[PDB]
Design a protein around this nucleic acid. Structure first.
Lengths: 73, 90, 246, 137, 105
RNA sequence: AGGAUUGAAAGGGAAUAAGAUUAAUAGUUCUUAAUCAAGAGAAAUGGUAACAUAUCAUGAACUUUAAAAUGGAGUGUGAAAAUCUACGGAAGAGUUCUCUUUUCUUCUUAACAAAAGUAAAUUCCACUGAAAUGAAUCAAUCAGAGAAGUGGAAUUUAUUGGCUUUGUAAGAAAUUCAAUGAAUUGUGGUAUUUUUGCAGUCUUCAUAAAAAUUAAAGGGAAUCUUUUGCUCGUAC
RNA sequence: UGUAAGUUAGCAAGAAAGAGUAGCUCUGGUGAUUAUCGAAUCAGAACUUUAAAGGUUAGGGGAAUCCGACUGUUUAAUAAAAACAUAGCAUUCUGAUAAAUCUAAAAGGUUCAUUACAGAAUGUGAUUUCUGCCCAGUGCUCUG
RNA sequence: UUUCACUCAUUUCGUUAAAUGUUAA
């Protein structure tokens, strides 16, 4: 697994056509946007709610989105 | 520390006074440092029987088994130098 | 009777040489035109310890007088050689320690080592630690020179036999007294199986000709003819003399 | 003065070890930022290759081409030679000063190829040989 | 303390059978296989360990980047900088001496 | 171009881990997350230097160097784990007519990668030139073929880069609670042992393997996605 | 605390011999960091008792004589030793196409990847002191 | 028959069978 640092790369990754799945996890302090690509599982630790919403709109509707919470699926 | 048995006190009391005497002279000269013929430093120590290495100088020298230069091996170098000079001159 | 220990030595089963960590064959390089009529220069890359022998070995590196590459040789160190030294092999080589010259060019009285008994056979005589041979005289009529072997014997060789000027390194090795049985055990690490030697008188009559009776003794003279068969040739052989020398 | 403009040196250390350079400006004291005695040199990074009479004339041009370099070097990392070039002939070298060199940024490529062409044309005329012949270690 | 077992079928403390015991979720301790300690490179002349190159297994050098298996210098990766400096001076000084000694003395 | 066959389930060797699962198999199955090999879609900069740059930035024949690949002893020390312990707690359990702010249990984290913060040791580079000689270790040992000082570079420290930290990753697992759903999961130690490295010292008439295989150099000849990974052992 | 004769001057030597040691309450020494923190270790003092290493673990000592110098090995299943080995000392042969020696033979094989400071064959058994006389007999040898 | 001189069988060797011998330069 790899970790992306700032906001610019994740959108470029999201807009890239190499995506396969997206899973969003909400923790007691932050929100993680794990993007499942072909090779790696990129993740992004987000602590700003407004910036998280911007990310959620950036997700193409065709891809499958999994929401994870205190109870695992 | 010791009256007269300096380096051969590690042999204790079990090899004969005469044999411990002979081995003392050889072991002292085998473990001492010698003047290095290329850098004039007391920095040559034996690595194996016949191989001597200059520590702070980076050279390997072939020598005697326990001493850097043997008496027989020193006169020979003198002899060859005289022979070479005579041959080169007429 | 049985077959004695000297008979079992000639089959070479456990008496084979323990030569696994040895460096290799130590000898001059093969003779060629450039050694017959010129000089080839070698570089003493390093001096190494060859197991089983008391003299150090030099890893000389000549270049390639006829092709491209390196000719990694393996000489026997002469006393005084050092790493990074240049040595010249050939008929025109200067009379310096470590140089290889035909035995005819050496002035009478020169001390050489690693001499070839026959031209081009890459070294026979004067190869142990501290040993050397002296040139006695030349004979230009039949191209022969006389040398004095380390045993004292005089030998006549061809004047073009090669030899290395100097003294084999590591002299004075045997003057240090072994003190312990264990130390002698380690001496034959890279040699044959010979060390713990049981006296013939301590054996039984089947084992050895000396294997005695109610008192440990030989019984018959220990000086024997050279023609004795293997099996009874035990002791002094063709002894011209006995007893302490005066 | 051993180290004077126009003197040919051989670089002893660094990426350009073994290359032949030409001294342009000398400073044995060193500037504020340069705490060492240095010299600004222009050298032949890639020596020209030998050519024969069978290659086409366009090949002989690229084969005889010279790739040069300009570098500030400590005077303790150069070994001056006995050969001296004329900076009047190599007028492009004379413009290489300490203020032309900035720390951490790429030397101008256009200037480097400018001197490189000047080096090549001089060698094509054969006037200077020891500078352009390669050193075999 | 939690006692562990060899995971592979080797059962002897050989050089290639080295292991490390590390902790794991639930308090259990698992067994890893650790790599052998390797030597680096040496100068072809002075036999000194070269700087700038890692001490890894021979095959792992191919995995490294092209610039991470050498040093950007003449004879880089086979000779030390001191080894190289002596080479240059020998090549230049001897050649210059040959021009004065012989070749129109 | 150079020498044929065989010879190691303890020598060399491309690449995988955590959790779960079975009446029994599991670095082999399942979930998740990785790695490796073979394939498919006139030719670079920076640094004074040691040297450094997400593939970059061409590099044939031929030749050399290095790795694979090297004894043992003893001393010092870096790091991890276990045990012990300091402070702060959360949950459960035991004793309790004699006391005990009490005694005990749980408080965890992989392969592979990242680079906030920050180490020990060794070797080199630049400035300068040491005598009133200095620098240093438990011991040593070192210096005008250049010490000490200041500023740098590199390598090693059980994967990337050693340790804390981060992604994996809490969604797992452990300890409790309720009847599947809920809670918590700090920071340290000039302590002992073990493991693993490192540094120098001692010792040998002992010097303590080879090849497959890989990389680099000298030389200048030529002009990210995807497929596949066969045979045999595997119970006890 | 104390320790002899003897000695290869290294040892003997843990020689021999004597005293102390428990529990509890205290006191002091040995550092780090710059007042706070930390380590088991040593020494000392009052008091008490059933007077203290001893549950377990845990050398009997001395005076001599013989043999072997020592560490080591040995008759698996009645002999572990004074026997074998050992270092040291001494003798004999051999210049390598040799000496020893395996094989029926052999561009065959072992010491030998070696070269007299080496290879092969023997006796004695560390050190110190010393090895006397005999070449007739039997061997061995002669450059005769 | 002995003593010579030679090599041509024969022995013992060395190498990548890598300038041997005689003229020439």
């Amino acid at each position: 697994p790899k970790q992306v640092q700032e906001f610019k790369q994740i959108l470029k990754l999201l807009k890239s056509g190499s995506i396969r799945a997206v899973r969003v996890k909400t923790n007691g302090e932050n929100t993680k946007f794990k993007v499942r690509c072909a090779k790696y599982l990129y993740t992004y630790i987000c602590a700003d709610k407004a910036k998280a919403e911007e990310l959620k709109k950036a997700i193409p509707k065709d891809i499958h989105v999994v929401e994870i919470a205190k109870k695992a699926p | 520390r010791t009256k007269k048995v300096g380096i051969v006190g590690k042999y204790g009391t079990r090899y004969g006074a005469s044999l411990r005497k002979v081995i003392k002279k050889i072991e002292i000269a085998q473990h001492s440092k010698y003047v290095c013929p290329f850098c004039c430093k007391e920095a040559v120590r034996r690595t194996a029987c016949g191989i001597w290495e200059c520590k702070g100088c980076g050279k390997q020298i072939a020598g005697g088994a326990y001493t850097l230069s043997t008496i027989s091996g020193a006169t020979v170098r003198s002899t060859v130098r005289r022979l070479r000079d005579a041959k080169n001159s007429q | 009777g049985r077959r004695t220990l000297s008979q079992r030595k000639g089959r070479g089963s456990i008496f084979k040489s323990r030569s696994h960590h040895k460096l290799g064959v130590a000898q001059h390089r093969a003779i060629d035109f450039f050694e017959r009529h010129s000089t080839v220069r070698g570089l003493v890359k390093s001096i190494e310890h060859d197991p089983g022998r008391g003299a150090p070995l030099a890893r000389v590196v000549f270049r390639n007088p006829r092709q491209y590459g390196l000719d990694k040789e393996l000489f026997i160190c002469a006393e005084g050689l050092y790493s990074g030294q240049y040595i010249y092999c050939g008929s025109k080589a200067s009379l310096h320690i470590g140089n290889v010259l035909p035995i005819g060019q050496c002035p009478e009285g020169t001390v050489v080592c690693n001499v070839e008994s026959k031209p081009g056979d890459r070294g026979i005589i004067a190869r142990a630690s501290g040993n050397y041979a002296t040139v006695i005289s030349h004979n230009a009529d039949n191209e022969t020179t006389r040398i004095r072997l380390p045993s004292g014997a005089k030998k006549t060789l061809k004047s073009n036999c090669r030899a290395m000027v100097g003294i084999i390194a590591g002299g004075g090795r045997t003057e240090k007294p072994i003190l312990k049985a264990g130390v002698a055990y380690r001496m034959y690490k890279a040699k044959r199986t010979t060390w713990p030697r049981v006296r013939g008188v301590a054996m039984n009559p089947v084992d050895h000709p000396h294997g005695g009776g109610n008192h440990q003794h030989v019984g018959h003279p220990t000086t024997l003819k050279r023609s004795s068969p293997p099996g009874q040739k035990a002791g002094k052989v063709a002894a011209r003399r006995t007893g302490l020398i005066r | 003065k051993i180290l004077a403009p126009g003197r040919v040196v051989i670089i002893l250390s660094g990426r350009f070890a073994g290359k032949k350079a030409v001294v342009s400006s000398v400073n044995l004291q060193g500037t504020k930022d340069r705490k060492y005695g240095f010299v600004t040199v222009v050298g032949v990074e890639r020596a020209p290759l030998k050519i024969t009479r069978k290659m086409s004339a366009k090949v002989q041009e690229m084969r005889t081409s010279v790739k040069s370099f300009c570098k500030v070097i400590n005077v303790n990392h150069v070994m001056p030679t006995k050969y001296t070039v004329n900076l009047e002939q190599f007028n492009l070298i004379k413009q290489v000063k300490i203020n032309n060199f900035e720390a951490g940024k790429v030397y101008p490529i256009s200037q480097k190829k400018a001197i490189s062409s000047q080096f090549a044309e001089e060698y094509r005329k054969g006037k200077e040989s020891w500078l352009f012949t390669k050193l075999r270690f | 303390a939690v006692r562990v077992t060899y995971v592979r079928k080797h059962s002897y403390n050989t050089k290639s059978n080295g292991i490390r015991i590390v902790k794991t979720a639930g308090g259990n301790m698992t067994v890893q296989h650790r790599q052998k300690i390797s030597n680096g490179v040496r100068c072809g002349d002075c036999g000194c360990v070269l700087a700038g190159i890692r001490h890894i297994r021979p095959h792992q050098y191919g995995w490294l980047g092209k610039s991470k298996r050498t040093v950007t210098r003449a004879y880089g990766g086979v000779k030390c900088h001191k080894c190289v400096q002596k080479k240059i001076l020998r090549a230049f000084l001897i050649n210059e001496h040959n021009l004065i000694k012989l070749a129109a003395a």
